Amino acid sequence: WTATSGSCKGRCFELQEVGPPDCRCDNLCKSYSSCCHDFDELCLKTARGWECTKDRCGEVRNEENACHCSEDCLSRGDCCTNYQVVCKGESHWVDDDCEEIKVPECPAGFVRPPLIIFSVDGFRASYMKKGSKVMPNIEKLRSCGTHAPYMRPVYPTKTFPNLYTLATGLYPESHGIVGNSMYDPVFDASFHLRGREKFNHRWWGGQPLWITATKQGVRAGTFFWSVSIPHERRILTILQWLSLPDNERPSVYAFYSEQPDFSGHKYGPFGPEMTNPLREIDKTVGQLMDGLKQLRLHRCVNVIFVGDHGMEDVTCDRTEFLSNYLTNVDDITLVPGTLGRIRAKSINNSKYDPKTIIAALTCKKPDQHFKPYMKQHLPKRLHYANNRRIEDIHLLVDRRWHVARKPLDVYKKCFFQGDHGFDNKVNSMQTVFVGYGPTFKYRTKVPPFENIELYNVMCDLLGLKPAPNNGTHGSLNHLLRTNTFRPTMPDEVSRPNYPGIMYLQSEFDLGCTCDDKVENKLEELNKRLHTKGSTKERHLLYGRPAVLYRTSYDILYHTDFESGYSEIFLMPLWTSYTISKQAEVSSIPEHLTNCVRPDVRVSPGFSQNCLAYKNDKQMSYGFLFPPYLSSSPEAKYDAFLVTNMVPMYPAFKRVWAYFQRVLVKKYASERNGVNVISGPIFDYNYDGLRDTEDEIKQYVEGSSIPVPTHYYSIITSCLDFTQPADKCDGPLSVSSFILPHRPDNDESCNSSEDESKWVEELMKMHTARVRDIEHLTGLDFYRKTSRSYSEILTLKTYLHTYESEI
């Protein structure tokens, strides 16, 4: 019940919402059916439109008008945004040359430059070039301020998961808005786009920017706007709030536009109908900047122009139906469209079986436009698993397609030509970023970055301490003229041991054998230097990775590679090696095929053993430093040490062997040498974070050798590829991946072909940021370079996407 019988007199768009059943006058009351009776009359005036004309100049104040052109409107803070232009001979902000804003130029009583976030729904990155003719205010913000060629959204590339990521710095799996439709089995409640359930606070996790601000005593404008409040009124409300007295005035504001997403759904991203919504957005930006200039705030306010996601071409006739694959279609609930999520229709039917649902959906038709995944097998870069609201079965849908349960769902539920929600690496889903103001750089282009990074920067812009989030604070310092945050390297928690020769061969009973007794002060002086770290500067280019947790591990040096060997996990945490452009690939000699050699630096009790692999019929083994890339026949023996061995399913060895035999050398040829760091990952609870040993769910049968869920590599080279990787004077270039360690290659529909047709395609799909590998391993990489730490943080958040150029 709301006793809507109170009044909005002097309360229009009041900043704190008043508790039921007193009636509300805040920018969200319309959404809750709870506004006072006079809200429309008082708060949504429209008389006379939004622009001053010649004849209203100096008019007698008439309180009915939407905005005012009377002489007092500046002191009252409610002129039309073009007031000074029409009635005082002033120029529009877009007509003025840009002039660097070196310092904030603020009216008295402003303690800090305000931040205004102008968020646009569906604003695809290429609109900045393609619509440039019809967006002069936006093109000025972009060319005068700081801009990226595009900004990567999070998955799924839907509206609320992305806007709430902007507000919290968290992945959707952590903030909890994981789609535009959700079931929470703990609440036993559902969230939908239409409805009042979506307003319940318990859907919304983390701490959004407005709550961070408020807790730290910075006032905030209310971010959410009811759909029927027109854009001109949203802008005028923000400008009026900007005229409040110092003690009441917010420092942070948001504007939001439903366009161009609205029209994009109907007409497609580049439909001829799309020119007008882009014109109209630009004109709204023009109103804001003219209003700020009127208030003398246009060289004081930081303005962010930011999208939530792009828009792709999608039509009714590109729909795949689960009824064309499954017979039990009525025993499932599908969340449909640009991604799929599948669960059982009833918790009381124990015949529904996820494993056979997946198998019925896997590589079933030659041109199949979706791929089913258990959520924990999705590419780790999506970070889309660790939330009870995400269903175990997921369908990644090819761009341009939908998935639906039954054809009837599509014509009885064509109507649309655009949609979004696809994989966040897809070029059509990329969106925009522009920062303009005293704290942003002048005329600067920065590389593309992910939207999870903005919350930190918005906190920096406001002098706030960010709540814990998924951004890497300092990675976007290069966007800012000042207020940068000066990160420091995490402290190493565990220091390594440097073991020497301590064990005789006969102490090992590992059931390993090698044909190596086919056995000189010239070459034994050398073996010794190699085991002391004499070639370490060649293979360890950026320092040893730091171990950020408590553990026991050994550095092991070799001619061709260096490793950090875990006495707890019985395998390396990392193995580092450099392949120059000139390197040669050799084979594994026939007599060495099954060779495994005890490492006399590491005790039997902390080594793997060969008998465990012999007795584990499902599990085989691979090596981290590959024998194919040994620098000489004698160095090759080092590659067969039991301390370089890791457990691998046979199906996985197919991938790993191709990467190591063919692709490392291809990359070294293309990139003028590479440094590779590879290693195992254990993430059995799929939370994106390194497992402790007591979380391991699978071991090599009858042993304490844990089986990894993934294997990573980080491949680093010189950004200026005229310089060799091992002799690089400036910025680095990196690509990385996190390959799932699976017992089948069901993910790859072409796997029965030659590895040259499918392996690299798999690796690309599992591309990753160094930062993702850091979370998964508790390691910190690049600790010793000649680069600034901020630059290294930007490199660690880089993602190599393999899309073509936008």
Ligand SMILES: *[C@@H]1O[C@H](CO)[C@@H](O[C@@H]2O[C@H](CO)[C@@H](O[C@@H]3O[C@H](CO[C@H]4O[C@H](CO)[C@@H](O)[C@H](O[C@H]5O[C@H](CO)[C@@H](O)[C@H](O)[C@@H]5O[C@H]5O[C@H](CO)[C@@H](O)[C@H](O)[C@@H]5O)[C@@H]4O)[C@@H](O)[C@H](O[C@H]4O[C@H](CO)[C@@H](O)[C@H](O)[C@@H]4O)[C@@H]3O)[C@H](O)[C@H]2NC(C)=O)[C@H](O)[C@H]1NC(C)=O
């Ligand atoms: C990305 O960035 C985020 C934020 O830093 C990281 O997420 C954090 O991870 C840590 C480590 O796991 C979590 O710590 C654990 O927290 C609980 C306390 O839980 C409450 O307090 C915090 C702090 O205010 C809240 O933010 C929590 O909010 C979660 O739950 C509510 C629902 O209750 C929901 O509204 C939120 O959306 C959010 O859900 C997500 O997180 C939970 C787990 O917390 C997860 O189940 C869910 O799927 C969602 O993803 C919450 O109200 C504490 O009890 C734990 O202690 C236990 O473990 C120790 C081990 O030391 C045991 O000894 C002990 O007995 C306990 O059992 C943890 O400390 C932290 O909550 C979490 N924060 C958020 C906001 O998610 C991610 O890890 C980052 N991702 C990557 C890849 O880096």
Ligand SMILES: CC(=O)Nc1ccc(C#Cc2ccc(F)cc2)cn1
């Ligand atoms: C009817 C309807 O949907 N209204 C609506 C929806 C969303 C928003 C937002 C937002 C936002 C989040 C994070 C930001 F950093 C900036 C803006 C405002 N109004």
Ligand SMILES: [Ca+2]
């Ligand atoms: Ca984990």
Ligand code: NA
């Ligand atoms: Na052997």
Ligand code: NA
């Ligand atoms: Na085996």
Ligand SMILES: [Zn+2]
């Ligand atoms: Zn949309």
